[PDB]
Symmetry: D2
């Protein structure tokens, strides 16, 4: 039951199942995986595709001949399995040169190098068929207040993204960008810390239509925010270009638990929203099998990501299709929320005594919302305990 | 020393010093204050002005004659003291009718009433000389996932703000709106939970130039975010129309401590930013003297808000003026951060071997940022311990 | 299905279903309930009993004749329904006199009054048959560092609890005390902020056997802690005298959501632990129907508390009884965790080359824990998705 | 000014200034330091001593001859500088064998090895003159609920500490143990997550007098707790055997900022408490110079730890010595808090009409606490802004 197929568009980063287990306090617990191995194992589990940072696929500093051979082997694995590559990204965070940032490093020479490294990988992403190019500015930020003038940093960040937009336009590429917010870690505070900040920034770019967000479940939860709500705002803005699915237990370091772990009810409401809205992008997992696990546990954890999505999809669909739930949604006036407040216009509203002088505030205040009954129907559907 | 004068534009809400001390678990500890008393006492402390919700100035449900008398007494107090009223707002959160929201209540009749209540108070705000009209949507949100369709709620929120913009335009008013984000409390999650989300929303309004943000120190800190960073993004966007100053100890219920309490170093960096950027708006305190205090403690707490701002202003100015700090800022390449990455343009960057083939990444990575020395100069200046 | 019966020992505070809906920003949305009404309605839902603060049952300041009549009516309702009263507590937080604390108020006269108020209610609790007397020191703490010397406050808190222990011993009462930790709210920081701090404090009382803890789900989660882990430590110490069940979404103000809401997987692991350990005390709900609800929603929310406990009980029992789970627990070495490390004793351990010189650390490190497979079996059982 | 001397007992872990800068997302930015270098540089800054994990001083897996040479070189550096070694600890977290724990690993063979590794290092610590042996169980815990039975784990943790106590007693050593709590990171939840939980656990050991706590500023702040309050409870219990000083910005990953950074006012209240209580132990820094820094920044950051302690010590002493502050403390009844509530005894309290029938609750409730004036005096003293 709940068996994923490529139809479900489940994708995984090479760096997810390939995470060797090094953490702030501990050495690697697993050997490195050949990307070819990961492609073949993920395909066997029913994944649709993979994603990569440049330096996951091509060791940093590789010669041109080494680069070609790494890409050739990877493409053979994709061809052997039918796996796709819908998204790629740049590693602008691991190498020591990026310790103060890539696009917003205080050192101008580093900013220029970061752009050149990204541009090289955009070309590769396009060659592999990627539709989306993600940017996670994990080193953009500060540990201290004097170190980073945030207005100047935002100017540099806009300049960088504008140059990248000029680049893809000039080459006729169809790829679009997706900015991944995170509030902190590895920097004390990261620039563009939430979906909202990233959405706001995009509106100030020269070609805003080329940019959207890549929100990650656990990153919004690291600020204690409601991930489904943030996804709804991204959808409302037309900017949900990609998504990273995982789990997180609240305000901690980024745990990258398998999807469904962490906040299970938020996972339910997320799947309900994505499916109801008709989100058509990849269901991408940015997760880490815990370092306690051997390779059998790696593949079990990856399989669990997909299984949990599919269970939640079933339960959310049953919730929305249940005539008792539909009745409860009307009892709670969800239908009214979707109607305009004043399609009659401002003057009619100003002239409407029912909106002021003749509005019975105490009668309105007496009406219960019936939200608890609705939420218990939702709980019963999630748990398969209807009756 | 540190004596405030009206020149400093320090303002206070009537509801701040007037808070009677009722909390989730406890009854009022102080009697209600007449707004006339608060105006006269705040003026004696060196405040510049006050702000109000409609229902702070005019008891909810007052007749027209009662409304006139309350306003007349208040205006006499303002005239007697020279106090100004730069900002006003609507109470769309206390009355039970607003239990599911004002502008985004599921019930359409409540949404229409909320708009009419706001419009009435915009007229009053203009008559009192206010330049800014704040909106804090404290009831906009949910405790459960099925209760609020966030895309529909954002449609209703946009409709409401668009109608308000149409209203002020039609009346020829110069007032502008400032949206106050908060992540949670009193709702389980509040819509537009951070500065970023509010900035992003504004960009989708029909007349975006009429709307900015009113960020509150403690509200961003309730999501664990860096308040100075968020203020920098608001300034970068041209949207810092007003600000609420207070203190908060991290991720808790909204404490509304006096300014300077809570995160003292964030208060330092905030004042440094506001003064460096030339922010010209009110320095408004949205705080609550703790319910442990009698009226002498109320006025001491209000005086402390202003005193702490003035101490921090002195220390931040001394930091920026110190030739040793200026040297340290250059050592940390803050000057380079302010220079364009590629004013030479995209093609020149692509052709520049110094940005890629000839970039010595290991030499760049070896350069220290010297951020710790800079931050210890900042600490020494804050504490008055230079030497 | 999942129908509670008095056998299940589900109990509710009068103040839970009786919460009128006043919050930091909003007036009451529901009328006050007569305790007689609450007893009869809860009995109809299958509750076993209720609990009370003194001032929930007897209005503060009541005369002796008024006190007798309130108690008489309440006892008739209990007799009419078969409901029990297993626990009572003192309100040492609502009245303004307690603004700086009860037992740890700086003012000695208030500390003495707090003790006398508690003692009067202990007598009543015993007359009503209560086995446990809870103390929630919600006002014990501070908003500022100079206001409360914590060593002195702990001396006063120990003195108070020691006097209460002397009192019950002198009267021959069988009741025991349960201290309820909370980290913050309504004070900026509350003394004894977690289960651990309360357990440690109890060990320093003169008669430690008379005192245990009353942990609350949401309170430990307000510090981001693992509630099942804290309950395990309380059980390990023999100190889980009572428990408060509810839901919470992480590090926020105390939400008091119905049980099962908030962190659903933590609720699952909690029920698994309580049932596995054979906890025999009340399953008490300290929750608040949201102020959006009318009385039908109040009773729906209370029913949901019990329903969710019973669903989780079923799923946890099925998890533990599943031979595939039992196999996975052995694969993960949960059986070994329960065996002594060195029942052979210290000298044998020191002499055992297999524990040092001949321990193959790399072979040990290669063994996977298989925790992900185990956790996905747990998820499948929780969701009823085995297959 | 503020120049540290060995008199001040400032100590640093080898792993602090020696941190190479590897984080969850980034490679090392600094070369490894020879412990001899660190001893000599720290001595030049005015440190009193260093501390070590076994594997900081002796590379894991070293032969007996290699171990002797590493220790010999280290002791020569200590002799050359006058530096002391007051504390040592075991690394039971870096090596992959410890991925599920040391003392509470599910695998019994790992638990036995962990004990043998610790015992070997206790012998070395004693030879180097250490008075305290710290245990930070960073791998004791879980990412999932089924993986770790916490009651069984606490049994194993007690068994391990009891064996260590038997060991030191049998050898006649004067060293004592200090348990370091942390709430999470690197495990999803860590056992003994706070000072309170550790204090409570110690009370159940066979020889409780041999064990205390080593609280770390940032670790308690990772649960949003008040670090000075927790230190006060440890002092009240007689269990503050050692302390780790650093900075933290709230509920995040463990930042290990230099002391004084992070929550500056909490640092002030901590120093006030340690000095007022006469804490006589090391002022030990467990911090990490940010990976942005070169070695000059490492030494600047270490110097800043000590400087900030000394500034805060001066300001707290001036606060306590100021006759205006002493008056304000009496106005706030801090003197009364230190007096017994009922030295007259229980019967006298029960018979005292002034404690109940004749207690004027409204007159008591009207008295203000004057805490805001007191706290503003504290702020003025911290900032050197008295006047
Ligand atoms: Mg619709
Ligand atoms: Mg500039
Ligand atoms: Mg057992
Ligand atoms: Mg004393
Ligand atoms: Mn992540
Ligand atoms: Mn991601
Ligand atoms: Mn606030
Ligand atoms: Mn505000
Ligand atoms: Mn609670
Ligand atoms: Mn409770
Ligand atoms: Mn730490
Ligand atoms: Mn430490
Ligand atoms: Na700039
Ligand atoms: Na979209
Ligand atoms: Na709509
Ligand atoms: Na602006
Ligand atoms: Na005392
Ligand atoms: Na127990
Ligand atoms: Na055991
Ligand atoms: Na001590």
């Amino acid at each position: 039951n709940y068996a994923p197929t490529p139809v479900d568009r489940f994708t995984f980063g090479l760096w997810t199942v390939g995470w060797q287990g090094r953490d702030p306090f501990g050495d690697a617990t697993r050997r490195a995986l050949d990307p070819v191995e990961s492609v073949r194992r993920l395909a066997e589990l029913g994944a649709h595709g993979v994603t990569f940072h440049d330096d996951d696929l091509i060791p940093f500093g590789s010669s041109d001949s080494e680069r070609e051979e790494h890409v050739k082997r990877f493409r053979q694995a994709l061809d052997d399995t039918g796996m796709k590559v819908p998204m790629a990204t740049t590693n602008l965070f691991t190498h020591p040169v990026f310790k103060d940032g890539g696009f917003t490093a205080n050192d101008r020479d580093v900013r220029r190098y970061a752009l050149r490294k990204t541009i090289r990988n955009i070309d590769l992403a396009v060659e592999l068929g990627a539709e989306t190019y993600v940017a996670w500015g994990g080193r953009e930020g500060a540990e201290s207040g004097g170190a980073k003038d945030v207005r100047d940093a935002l100017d540099r960040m806009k300049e960088a993204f504008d140059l990248l937009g000029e680049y893809v336009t000039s080459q006729g590429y169809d790829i679009r960008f997706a900015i991944e917010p995170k509030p902190n870690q590895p920097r004390g505070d990261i620039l563009l810390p939430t979906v909202g900040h990233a959405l706001a920034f995009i509106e100030r770019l020269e070609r805003p239509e080329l940019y959207g967000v890549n929100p990650e479940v656990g990153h919004e939860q690291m600020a204690g925010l409601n991930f489904p709500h943030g996804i709804a705002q991204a959808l409302w803005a037309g900017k949900l270009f990609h998504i990273d699915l995982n789990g997180q237990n609240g305000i901690k370091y980024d745990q990258d638990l398998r999807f469904g772990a962490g906040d299970l009810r938020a996972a339910f409401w997320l799947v309900d929203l994505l499916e109801s809205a008709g989100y058509s992008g990849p269901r991408h997992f940015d997760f880490k099998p815990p370092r306690t696990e051997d390779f059998d546990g790696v593949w079990a954890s990856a399989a669990g990501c997909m299984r949990n999505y599919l269970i939640l999809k079933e339960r959310a669909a049953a919730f929305r299709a249940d005539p008792e739930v539909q009745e409860a949604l009307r009892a709670s006036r969800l239908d009214e929320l979707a109607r305009p407040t004043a399609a009659d216009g401002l003057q009619a509203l100003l002239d409407d005594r029912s909106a002021f002088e003749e509005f019975d505030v105490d009668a309105a205040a007496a009406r219960g919302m019936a939200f608890e009954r609705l939420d218990q129907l939702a709980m019963d559907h999630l748990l398969g305990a209807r009756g």
